[PDB]
């Protein structure tokens, strides 16, 4: 079943309970059974329309006999219609099979751009590359002053302006927006 | 993106990433190949008379017909890259052959000259001129080939 | 430099060609600019430098021939455009408002009828951003927008 399974517009059995968008994602942040994926560089809610576009575009563009795709995100559950909150850094759709990045990246980037938040088609190699170059940036930055240092030390009384979550986001996350160039 | 507090904006600006700046710009600072090698080495001894032409103006069918007419004799036509042919000249000690193989080159290795009939065939096509060659380590110009033919 | 002469019969003759000056300050440099220590030390008005990479009718010379870096070729091209627009190359022409540091071709810029508010003003570009890293002897950096 290489194609993405159809999801439901609303859950059959509505659950009770368990922001949900701000900050880095803690779940499904790493590859599992695949080599390519849609990385969510921002936070947002996924509607059934978004999911349907994911599914249709991926299924039609994808080669079933050489590529398989899997949902790395649950079905819409939060009522409003139903939505699936997604945090920055979470993989939305994963793909494997006997194909290559250059092969899948076209339609993966198309669907990523149609997603409701900043998204990027990323392979395992490119995910590792971006992580390593972010590490290199924070290692070689010539600015003596970093958001982490200033916030943690409360220099200038800056916690009067920063949020408590800022001491962990380190300036790389603001609202639902993940600033990737922020070091 | 919702507008930040001005103090937070100042914080972000002061903490912006600053890449290292090198003092001087680095840019402004300072087995098919071996198969062809052995094949050409062997051919240089197997062949006794060698000529070269520019069989690139011909069509597929015309080139095939020329190949048929050549195979009617023992002569064999060969194509090899000039990039790998240039070292072969100095390797085999053919200094006078350097200014002969440039652009498209088609060798005509043989041991028995049917050059008379080959020139007759070339005559009905007023192009594809014969080029200089070197039979048995003796460079021959086109006039030399004509004299040898006659 | 080869020139084609006709008489019809036409033939090409190679004439005298200048040679690089002896004793470059920085031998073993990537481009001529680096070899002569001019990486960030020339401007649009340095016609003596610029004209050495210019066709007789004002066109630029190709990078492959000039040997310049990619960035240095871009800088020289922009500086030459600015010099032509400023009239500093009266002899290099295809066959009256004084200007200088004109980034855009005069015929391709529309008037700024509605300059935005103070926080979103529409500014008039001056000079070229390619020369942003030129050696600055002034306390303030070059203002590329006015």
């Amino acid at each position: 079943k290489p194609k993405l399974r159809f999801i439901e517009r609303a859950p059959l059995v509505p659950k009770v309970r368990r922001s949900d968008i701000r900050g880095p994602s803690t779940e499904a942040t790493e590859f599992t059974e695949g080599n390519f994926a849609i990385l969510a560089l921002g936070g947002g809610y996924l509607h059934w329309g978004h999911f349907e576009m994911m599914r249709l575009t991926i299924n039609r563009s994808m080669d079933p006999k050489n590529m398989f795709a899997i949902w790395r995100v649950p079905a819409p559950f939060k009522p409003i219609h139903y939505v699936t909150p997604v945090k920055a850094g979470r993989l939305v759709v994963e793909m494997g099979g006997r194909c290559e990045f250059e092969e899948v990246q076209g339609f993966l980037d198309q669907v990523a751009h149609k997603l409701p938040f900043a998204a990027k088609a990323v392979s395992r190699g490119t995910l590792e590359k971006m992580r390593k170059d972010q590490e290199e940036r924070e290692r070689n930055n010539q600015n003596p002053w970093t958001f982490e240092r200033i916030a943690t030390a409360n220099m200038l009384g800056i916690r009067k302006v920063l949020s408590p979550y800022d001491l962990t986001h380190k300036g790389k996350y603001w609202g639902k927006f993940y600033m990737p160039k922020r070091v | 993106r919702r507008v930040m507090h001005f103090q937070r904006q100042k914080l972000m600006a002061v903490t912006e990433y600053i890449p290292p700046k090198p003092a001087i710009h680095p840019s402004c600072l300072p087995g098919l190949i071996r198969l062809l090698r052995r094949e050409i080495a062997a051919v240089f001894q197997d062949n006794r008379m060698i000529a070269v032409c520019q069989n690139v103006a011909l069509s597929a069918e015309d080139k095939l017909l020329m190949r048929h007419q050549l195979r009617k004799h023992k002569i064999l036509m060969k194509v090899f890259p000039n990039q790998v042919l240039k070292p072969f000249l100095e390797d085999s000690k053919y200094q006078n052959l350097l200014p002969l193989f440039v652009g498209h080159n088609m060798l005509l290795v043989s041991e028995e000259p049917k050059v008379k009939e080959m020139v007759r065939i070339l005559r009905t096509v007023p192009f594809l001129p014969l080029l200089g060659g070197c039979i048995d380590d003796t460079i021959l110009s086109r006039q030399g080939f004509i004299n040898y033919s006659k | 430099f080869r020139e084609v002469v006709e008489t019809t019969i036409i033939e090409g003759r190679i004439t005298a060609t200048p040679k690089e000056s002896p004793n470059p300050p920085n031998p073993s440099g990537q481009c001529p600019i680096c070899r002569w220590n001019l990486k960030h030390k020339y401007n649009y008005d340095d016609v003596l430098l610029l004209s050495q990479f210019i066709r007789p009718h004002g066109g630029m010379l190709p990078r492959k021939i000039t040997g310049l870096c990619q960035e240095e070729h871009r800088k020289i091209e922009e500086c030459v455009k600015m010099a032509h627009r400023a009239g500093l190359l009266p002899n290099h022409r295809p066959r009256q408002l004084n200007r200088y540091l004109t980034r855009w071709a005069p015929g391709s810029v529309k008037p700024i009828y509605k300059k935005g508010p103070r926080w979103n003003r529409v500014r008039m570009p001056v000079g070229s951003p390619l020369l942003r890293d030129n050696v600055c002897y002034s306390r303030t950096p070059w203002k590329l927008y006015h």
């Binding site: - | 001005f6 904006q9 100042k10 002061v14 | 926080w119």
Partner: peptide
């Protein structure tokens, strides 16, 4: 209306940060 940070403001903040870093050092012992 948006506001923007000037080089002078950045330098003022950096000067204050340097003073505070020296304060950290002198309090560390």
């Amino acid at each position: 209306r948006p506001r923007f940070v000037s080089l002078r403001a950045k330098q003022n903040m950096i000067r204050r940060l340097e003073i505070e870093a020296e304060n950290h050092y002198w309090l560390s012992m």
